[PDB]
Write a protein that holds these residues in place. Structure first.
Motif, short mmCIF file in Angstrom:
data_model
loop_
_atom_site.label_atom_id
_atom_site.label_comp_id
_atom_site.label_asym_id
_atom_site.label_seq_id
_atom_site.Cartn_x
_atom_site.Cartn_y
_atom_site.Cartn_z
N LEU A 56 0.81 -1.21 0.05
CA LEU A 56 -0.18 -0.06 -0.10
C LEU A 56 0.81 1.24 -0.03
N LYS A 57 0.31 2.45 -0.04
CA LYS A 57 0.96 3.73 -0.36
C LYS A 57 0.41 4.76 0.69
N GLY A 58 1.33 5.86 0.76
CA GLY A 58 0.84 6.90 1.21
C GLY A 58 1.00 6.77 2.89
N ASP A 59 0.00 7.10 3.69
CA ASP A 59 -0.13 6.73 4.90
C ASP A 59 -0.30 5.36 5.28
N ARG A 60 -0.43 4.52 4.04
CA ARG A 60 -0.23 3.20 4.29
C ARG A 60 0.85 2.36 3.72
N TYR A 91 -11.16 -3.08 0.58
CA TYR A 91 -10.27 -2.48 -0.42
C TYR A 91 -10.86 -1.11 -0.98
N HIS A 92 -12.32 -1.14 -1.17
CA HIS A 92 -13.09 0.08 -1.69
C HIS A 92 -12.97 1.14 -0.72
N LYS A 93 -12.46 1.14 0.65
CA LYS A 93 -12.71 2.00 1.23
C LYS A 93 -11.20 2.77 1.53
N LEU A 94 -10.11 2.16 0.83
CA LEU A 94 -9.12 2.97 0.59
C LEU A 94 -9.09 4.12 -0.31
N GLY A 95 -8.57 5.20 -0.36
CA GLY A 95 -8.62 6.13 -1.26
C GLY A 95 -7.61 5.65 -2.45
N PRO A 96 -7.80 6.49 -3.48
CA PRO A 96 -7.03 6.26 -4.76
C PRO A 96 -5.45 6.35 -4.23
#
Ligand SMILES: [Cl-]
Ligand SMILES: [Cl-]
Ligand SMILES: [Cl-]
Ligand SMILES: [Cl-]
Length: 99
Positions: A56-60, A91-96
């Protein structure tokens, strides 16, 4: 080995076999994936094709994701042969920006 959980339902299932915090029909598949994460000595061992292992990316950033079924994921940190912050999420509650 798995060393910590964020998600109480996964924790109950893994630690005590208590199933009430995950979907009943997914208990076996979730148990299988938890055991795979617990056995893995490096993040490669979790790289079975059916799991669609993804960082995952960003804060993740620093988190990994594997697929249970459809949009459902088990996510975790993996370092020096152990997994941390185990979570069960949509998965769909993760932002792009996060995936
Ligand atoms: Cl914990
Ligand atoms: Cl729970
Ligand atoms: Cl608990
Ligand atoms: Cl590794």
């Amino acid at each position: 080995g798995i060393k910590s959980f964020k998600h109480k339902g996964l924790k109950l299932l893994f630690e005590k076999g208590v199933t009430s915090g995950v979907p009943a029909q997914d208990v076996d598949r979730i148990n299988d994936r938890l055991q795979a994460i617990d056995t893995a000595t490096e993040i490669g061992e979790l790289n079975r094709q059916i799991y669609k292992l993804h960082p995952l990316k960003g804060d993740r950033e620093g988190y990994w994701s594997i697929t249970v079924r459809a949009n459902w994921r088990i996510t975790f940190q993996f370092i020096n042969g152990d997994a941390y912050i185990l979570n069960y999420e949509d998965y769909h509650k993760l932002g792009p920006e996060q995936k």
